[PDB]
Symmetry: C3
């Protein structure tokens, strides 16, 4: 009967269309390269005021070289003119009543205990220690550099998909609305401008610059390179997203080492709180390939061939 | 004959069970994301004694920012108060008999030869050089900071599988037996505590803290995120492993730059030996997908369909 | 007719050979690990002359620890003995006629404007600023350290394919023609020597050491680990390539902080131009697997089964 082939032909049309659209949607004919090879060069620009000091890129940015992870220092604690010696620790956790509770068995690790219980002040009695004196008092409150919100981060990112040897950069003057020197990334108005406003990045990550600068934190500027290398070079485009990674705070210690004319050594101990920026470059490209196209083909051919049998059994049996 | 279908039905039962278990074991129905996106923040805590000095996190940890690669300095060589000028190199390799063998053709690279053969000491005669004087003597023996074995490394790791947008952290209070502030990673007792004892890490890597601190080395704290994103969020868990990567030693040079009241410059040249720690975050997730499930399906369907024919030929023919 | 099976047998021979060679060529029977886990330790050696100074590894290499990204400083701009205060900016862009155009609305960001229009020199009138004085003059011309071309970069790279737990290093004495201490990488003569001549690396990237050292730049030493883990351990070999990533220049600012006997602070501000080296380790391994071998098998079986039908229709119909 002719209807049998009109039923089978309709079966093949519909089923093959479902299968066809499904496989065509997931790019099942594409080999995928998920090992992007990225290079990131960052440059921060701006100046702020902290205490009665002016902070420039050499004062608050660390490291200086412009790596994928850098820190803009917003608040810091200074302990000036430390020198090796003996002094009573100011931390209450080191409180003692006699030299019998200042032995090595107490607080394993941490500073060096001399073994004497000494009077840091009139209100506290702590174990004496050998080290940089006086000791640090990290419980005080200090200001924060507010101008850091208005600093700009310029991110140059140069990636390459090695499986296809397709390399490209994120400096795209045609895609930017304004000049490169004066543009400013906006997810909607200028999403390809490589210049980011620090405060903007803080907003895109859903963070308050006040609290963040106060406690420090870790934000991620995410550069995504989802690309179809079957399409034009113009189609491989970076997409920027932002996130807070510590989800607290972020601080680190470093000293400025000075020496006296008589040769003795003394440092300025600095506890730095700031916003660390981690440029995280993800990317995956898909290029047409014979092998995935053949495997997907056999899959769709056989799958339709079974679906028509099952549909005949489900339809005819009913 | 009915037995023919009882033979075929048994064929399908057994063969389909083998195939079924095989494909089900390898998660052939899963798409895999092998491009983990990790952020690592490390913090070292402890204090040691070297010479008649006390070393704190600001003295032996470099860099200070808490990156994925950092160095705990255990031994160092100091050459204090160097100044630009001329002096005889102390390295024997520069030995000379006359100014005729101190020309640019000799030892290309390395220091700057003035062209004069001068007497470094009474027992050695070396080419004179222009540079930081006096020259370094890197053949002496120095102590090592033993307290560095008892230092603790706290590793905060925040990763994300972008193909599935599944992000998670390694701070898991429910998985840790003890408090986060006081716990200590143990592969068996507390394998999810983010606080690692330096000496412990040295043991897990099969290394002697004595020899390692003496010669320096490169160890890797490996964080693995093998996850089945078909299962619960609770099931995606990090697994820590450890390894020595240099498999010798590790050292680097840096100077402390001082200036005189009259303006002349002089530095303290420091050759640092320590234990560099590289946090290596691997991970791959598998989530159910229609495409891999269909491809594997067709594969198992056809494979059984051929195995039954071949088994009929092998069985019936015999 | 026997010819029908001689036609079919020839069909299967030819078609199956095409399919067979195609699938065998792309290693369709292999699972692939594209998430290499690499560790990179770099060491630069050499000395240069800049001004009347001698630069050693402690002077021009930054950072010192030997990471995968480092910088060899070739040219720099020094602004010595800066101190917080007020002074007229030397940048023409800050030119003013009266204090009415030195308000916060002008040049948002950048230095701190006091609000006064002052005379930097007799030929220029600029807004006065609070900060490190005097201000920097980054428009002068300075020499470049030519010896940096002859420096050597030693790259120790230790990678691991985690999916197969196959770890290996790039120090291969058997593959190197000369001794490790004296060899020198040459793409043809010694392509496995880990010691690279800076000038050589500059040539392999198609760059002029003169212009590059003058303006600075970003080069990439690419280490590729394409490996067939079905073959011998000896067959997994690294291949080095080179590229310029900025495709201008590269510079960064850092200061040397000094303190006076009376306690006031003053720094030497340094703008550094150099060649940043980024070690980019790519790699992917392929190991025989049952699942990819079965999927490819079904694909080739079915594909031949359809090609023979289509070829019968194309041949017989004609
Ligand atoms: N907020 C910002 N506003 C303006 N410029 C900013 C900003 N942040 C970073 N930059 C960098 O500043 C460089 C131009 O400097 P410019 O502001 O005109 O002059 P300055 O006198 O202030 O100092 P400079 O030229 O940086 O030494 C560009 O170099 C690069 O990135 C730009 C660059 N570029 O934009 O062309 C490409 C590049 N690579 O690698 O392709 C590297 C740069 N870099 O490292 O600065
Ligand atoms: N051996 C160690 N013992 C105790 N604390 C240690 C140790 N190593 C590192 N830390 C970090 O120390 C922080 C708590 O400091 P705590 O010891 O209580 O106070 P201190 O007065 O000694 O100095 P501090 O608070 O660090 O400035 C925590 O912050 C963090 O990691 C912890 C942390 N945390 O544990 O909650 C989360 C975090 N991120 O990003 O989520 C970053 C930290 N960090 O950078 O230190
Ligand atoms: N152009 C170069 N010529 C000669 N040696 C150079 C050069 N660049 C770097 N190096 C490193 O120099 C080390 C040997 O030093 P050597 O030149 O003999 O002695 P020096 O007195 O000059 O100073 P040093 O031993 O480095 O403190 C080796 O250590 C290592 O890499 C080698 C090394 N190695 O070559 O055996 C293995 C290693 N890891 O991790 O396996 C790390 C090294 N490293 O960090 O220097
Ligand atoms: C950032 O720039 C805006 C623009 O004029 C300014 O109003 C604001 O005060 C600046 N932020 C700080 C902290 O000075
Ligand atoms: C950028 O714009 C110019 C227009 O002058 C065009 O010729 C060029 O092809 C464009 N490049 C890309 C990558 O779009
Ligand atoms: C160097 O002088 C300072 C005070 O100027 C003093 O505290 C120190 O003890 C002196 N050096 C030595 C080794 O005594
Ligand atoms: C490390 O801690 C243990 C615990 O008391 C102590 O016995 C040992 O001396 C410490 N190590 C060093 C080098 O002091
Ligand atoms: C952690 O423990 C609490 C128990 O108070 C539980 O409610 C929570 O769901 C747990 N979270 C995870 C991720 O296991
Ligand atoms: C500065 O003084 C030191 C000794 O105090 C001396 O060696 C040096 O020559 C002086 N500076 C100059 C430029 O001579
Ligand atoms: C590099 O080495 C060669 C080899 O002798 C030498 O001729 C050349 O002058 C050196 N380069 C510089 C900048 O000195
Ligand atoms: C290196 O050479 C030696 C020859 O003495 C040989 O025994 C060894 O197997 C070789 N190793 C490799 C990895 O080729
Ligand atoms: C310290 O001395 C310098 C000159 O030697 C001077 O400029 C400065 O004002 C002095 N310190 C203070 C706080 O005045
Ligand atoms: Mg304290
Ligand atoms: Mg020497
Ligand atoms: Mg300027
Ligand atoms: Na298939």
């Amino acid at each position: 009967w002719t209807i049998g082939i009109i039923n089978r032909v309709v079966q093949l049309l519909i089923i093959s269309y479902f299968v066809g659209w499904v496989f065509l949607h997931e790019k099942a004919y594409q080999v995928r390269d998920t090992a992007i090879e990225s290079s990131v060069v960052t440059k921060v620009k701006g100046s702020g005021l902290y205490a009665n000091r002016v902070m420039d890129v050499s004062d608050y940015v660390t490291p200086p070289q412009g790596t994928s992870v850098f820190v803009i220092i917003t608040k810091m604690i200074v302990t000036e003119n430390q020198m090796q010696g003996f002094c009573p620790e100011s931390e209450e956790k080191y409180r003692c009543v006699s030299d019998s509770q200042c032995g090595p068995e107490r607080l394993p690790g941490g500073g060096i205990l001399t073994g004497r219980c000494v009077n840091y002040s009139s209100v506290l009695r702590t174990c004496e220690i050998q080290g940089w004196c006086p000791t640090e008092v990290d419980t005080v409150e200090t200001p924060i550099m507010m101008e850091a919100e208005n600093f700009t981060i310029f991110i140059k990112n140069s990636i390459r998909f090695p499986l296809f040897n397709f390399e490209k950069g994120n400096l795209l003057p045609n895609l930017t609305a304004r000049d490169m020197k004066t543009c400013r990334f906006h997810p909607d108005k200028d999403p390809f401008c490589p210049i980011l406003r620090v405060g903007d990045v803080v907003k895109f990550a859903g963070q308050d610059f006040a609290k963040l600068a106060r406690t420090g934190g870790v934000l991620g500027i995410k550069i995504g390179w989802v690309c179809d290398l079957d399409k034009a070079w113009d189609q491989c485009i970076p997409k920027y997203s932002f996130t807070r990674l510590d989800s607290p705070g972020y601080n680190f210690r470093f000293a400025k080492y000075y020496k006296m004319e008589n040769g003795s050594e003394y440092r300025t101990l600095l506890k730095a709180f700031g916003i660390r920026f981690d440029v995280l470059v993800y990317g995956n490209a898909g290029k047409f390939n014979i092998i995935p196209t053949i495997i997907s083909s056999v899959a769709a051919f056989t799958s339709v061939g079974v679906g028509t049998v099952l549909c005949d059994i489900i339809l005819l049996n009913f």
